[PDB]
Amino acid sequence: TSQVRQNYHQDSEEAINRQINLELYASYVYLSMSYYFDRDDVALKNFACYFLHQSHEERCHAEKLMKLQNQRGGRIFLQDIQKPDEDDWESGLNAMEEALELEKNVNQSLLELHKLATDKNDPHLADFIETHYLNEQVCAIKELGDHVTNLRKMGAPESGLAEYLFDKHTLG
Amino acid sequence: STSQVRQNYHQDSEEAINRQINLELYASYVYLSMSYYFDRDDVALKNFACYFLHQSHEERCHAEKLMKLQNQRGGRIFLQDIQKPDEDDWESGLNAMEEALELEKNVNQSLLELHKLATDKNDPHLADFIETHYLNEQVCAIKELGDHVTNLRKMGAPESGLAEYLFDKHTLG
Amino acid sequence: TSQVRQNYHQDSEEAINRQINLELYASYVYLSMSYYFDRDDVALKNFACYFLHQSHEERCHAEKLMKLQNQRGGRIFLQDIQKPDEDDWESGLNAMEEALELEKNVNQSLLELHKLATDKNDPHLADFIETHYLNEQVCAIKELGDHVTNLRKMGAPESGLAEYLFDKHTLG
Amino acid sequence: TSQVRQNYHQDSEEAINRQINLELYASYVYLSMSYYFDRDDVALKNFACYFLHQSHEERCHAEKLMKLQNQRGGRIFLQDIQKPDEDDWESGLNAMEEALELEKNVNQSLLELHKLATDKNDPHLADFIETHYLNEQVCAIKELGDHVTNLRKMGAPESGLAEYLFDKHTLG
Amino acid sequence: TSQVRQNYHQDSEEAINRQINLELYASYVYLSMSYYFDRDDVALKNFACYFLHQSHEERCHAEKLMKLQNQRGGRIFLQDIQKPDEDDWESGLNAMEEALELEKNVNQSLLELHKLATDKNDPHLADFIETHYLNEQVCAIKELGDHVTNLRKMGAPESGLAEYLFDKHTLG
Amino acid sequence: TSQVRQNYHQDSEEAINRQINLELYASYVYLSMSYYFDRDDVALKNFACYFLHQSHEERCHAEKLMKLQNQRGGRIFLQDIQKPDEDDWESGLNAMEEALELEKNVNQSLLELHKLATDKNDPHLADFIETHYLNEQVCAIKELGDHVTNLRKMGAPESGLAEYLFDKHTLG
Ligand SMILES: [Fe+3]
Ligand SMILES: [Fe+3]
Ligand SMILES: [Fe+3]
Ligand SMILES: [Fe+3]
Ligand SMILES: [Fe+3]
Ligand SMILES: [Fe+3]
Ligand SMILES: [Mg+2]
Ligand SMILES: [Mg+2]
Ligand SMILES: [Mg+2]
Ligand SMILES: [Mg+2]
Ligand SMILES: [Mg+2]
Ligand SMILES: [Mg+2]
Ligand SMILES: [Mg+2]
Ligand SMILES: [Mg+2]
Ligand SMILES: [Mg+2]
């Protein structure tokens, strides 16, 4: 047992290792979307920049959980980072819809982690999840919803003009 | 199916670039694992942790630049799973530096094979890209890791915990 | 023989004279495109500025090759600069497609020059072409591909609105 | 007919296309002369810089006529740019004498262009040629005459000392 | 075998040790030339300064090859540095002609070293020689041929006035 | 006989040429030591930096003597620079002991040169050696003795820890 470990359930330690993997997985999905928009036959530079920024933020989300595992005296066990479900993300609107679904899936995992921390009477871990993850998730999900709504109302994805102008005026 | 930009870019080179993107992401993940080993309360060498986190971010840059190259030449990125590292516990500062040295020589071997493929397919843009952005970076990385291994061994690591502590402070700090 | 000449094949010297001509030709094509977009019945000022910049860069490409010829002790022999294939470039989209074909033709010529340098064991000339020309050509072709993709997706050339907005938001 | 065209004779439009060709020809002659002086067996760097500057100014002279053609509603028709009459310009003095001759030939063309504008009652074109071209030519011809006079008095082209000192003290 | 050594042929290691000696020999030749021009019976201070600068640059060329040898895991074996072929360099023109011959001999040795790197499939060593040495050699050879041409055209070495004015106006 | 020469014995001239050689020799020993410490299997960067700075200072000692030879109207005759006695300097302590022996040998040569200047009644040369060389040698020998003492007392060369900490805290 770590000399630092106090009130830190084995189930919590294991759940943090699963969440670390899911944040790295989210980083990889965003990295894939980024370079889709960099293709010469897609060529939406601000979509590319937006998703690359998201990719770097997900890596920070993972690193902060690795720091938490060590702060609580848990042991990090990394797993393979699975490749994203798509190679071709089809359109700006479809990438934003896939990102929205990804962020709600990550949020569901964080809410299960919070329930576990509550069930094991771990108020430090509950507070860490509320403070650093749950509001960030609600803000990310609201921003992706707003982007989806605008792209739909503009006529995406059938209007290439719509995706071009969204790229310039919202993401640029 | 052929990109409007594609010129003198062999399908074998496009595939070799997808394999190299995977290996650079792999190397990033190895260095991330090493970084958080040294952050453990029972290891607690912060400058080793910082050194390997910096290496992790640089390997991510190496991957992103190859993804940019793929699209520049009109090839198509196909990502694969990023395999977890061979170890969870890296044992010591010396053992982590020896594992990083082996990793960097394995990455360099892959880059030399990619350069040979660019040469055999008469792709001088790709040959130049690999020489300019990867091959001297690898030779510099391998020489630094060799220098670090030598100093740790000469100081008495890994048995001398005093050695790794003082190396952490005076070389990596 | 020049007092500076060393390891510089006659074939290489001749191929550098043909490349000087091709860079001046490319400069002239872009000058013609530039002033097409300046016509009162075309009036896309950022297309004009974009192609005039490209024309000035091709002149620089020519001058640097003339400098190389003298550095290696070859002798510059200039040839007529042929006028471009069109007087009327039709549309923003058509000029960009014509520029993309021109840059791929210039790249083919540079790759033949690199092969000749390699075949004559001229590592100085190989390196010169790689360092100053081959990566510039890859960047130029990618940028022109991106521009063609955006114009097509926006509905060019039939949409005069598409060419107007592209002129403003991408080239402006 | 262009919606902008007013008081612009077809002959004047055709004369401006001929003058664009002649300005681009002059630019090419000066570029040739520049890289002659850069040869390892000539090696007068301030002659080289002087002539390259003159090359770049002639390109500006051509672009300004292209702008004028579009301003008046005429249509630009480019022609091949003929290579210069020499590959080897022989000496600093001979280059300066050939430049003087070239500038007097361009001046003669500009004076015929002015007579045409006067004969067609085109005072805008007459003014444009007087304002932008005729005093520049008189200044250029006077400077080239001054340079020829000094190189001759100094002992050029037989004195290699003369050309070296002129390069340093007048052109440097 | 060094723990760093990878794809580095013994022949390449030995060729690098030979090139280190040749760069140190070139440094020594230029040091000799420098102090010939500092003699009270020669007294061309800018020739002295020019050659001493060339001497310090050759020392940098040697040091960078010593670094390369250790970077690749090869072992530096230093050899005697042979004194230059002359004690008395006769004139400014003669020193410049000897320097041009020296820089072409060093270039031939670097081209041989590049061929060896190519034959041993050592692209890192090939790129190192092209990046740091081959273009520097072409620039040095072009500069020395320019200097020889000017001194000859001015009347050197028989004109002590020529060498005096070249020392002031080109090297000062 | 040089027009500047006064009270400058042939024996003094010859001794100055021998001292120039010895200073160049010392520069080469320190260069060799420098790149020994840069080897991947030695890797003491501050030892490397220390010895390279010494190498550059010995070069300055040789150049100032060449200047003196010319100031006095003597004639420089350069000799081969012999390679150092070792390729492998074994340890930081062994390198410092070898440097101490070298500096005492150079000092002995300078003391014999001073005796020559005294025996030939050359007060200018006597003062030159005292002012520029003898106090510098005393300072270099004391510094090297202090470094040898500290390395021995720390437990070098058997303690790799000693040489590491000396590199950081004394040379760094
Ligand atoms: Fe996240
Ligand atoms: Fe990498
Ligand atoms: Fe070009
Ligand atoms: Fe003009
Ligand atoms: Fe050199
Ligand atoms: Fe000394
Ligand atoms: Mg985010
Ligand atoms: Mg797996
Ligand atoms: Mg690295
Ligand atoms: Mg361009
Ligand atoms: Mg013709
Ligand atoms: Mg002018
Ligand atoms: Mg190559
Ligand atoms: Mg010293
Ligand atoms: Mg000898």
Curated annotation (Swiss-Prot), chains A, C, D, E, F:
InterPro entries tied to this protein: Ferritin (IPR001519), Ferritin-like (IPR012347), Ferritin-like_diiron (IPR009040), Ferritin-like_SF (IPR009078), Ferritin_CS (IPR014034), Ferritin_DPS_dom (IPR008331)
Single annotated GO MF: ferric iron binding
Site (Essential for association with cargo receptor NCOA4): 18
Reactions listed under catalytic activity: 4 Fe(2+) + O2 + 4 H(+) = 4 Fe(3+) + 2 H2O
Gene symbol of the encoding locus: FTH1
Binding site for Fe cation 1: 23, 58, 61
Enzyme Commission number(s): 1.16.3.1
Species in which this protein is naturally found: Homo sapiens (Human)
GO cellular component: autolysosome; autophagosome; cytoplasm; cytosol; extracellular exosome; extracellular region; ferritin complex; ficolin-1-rich granule lumen
Protein name: Ferritin heavy chain
Residues covered by the Ferritin-like diiron domain: 6-155
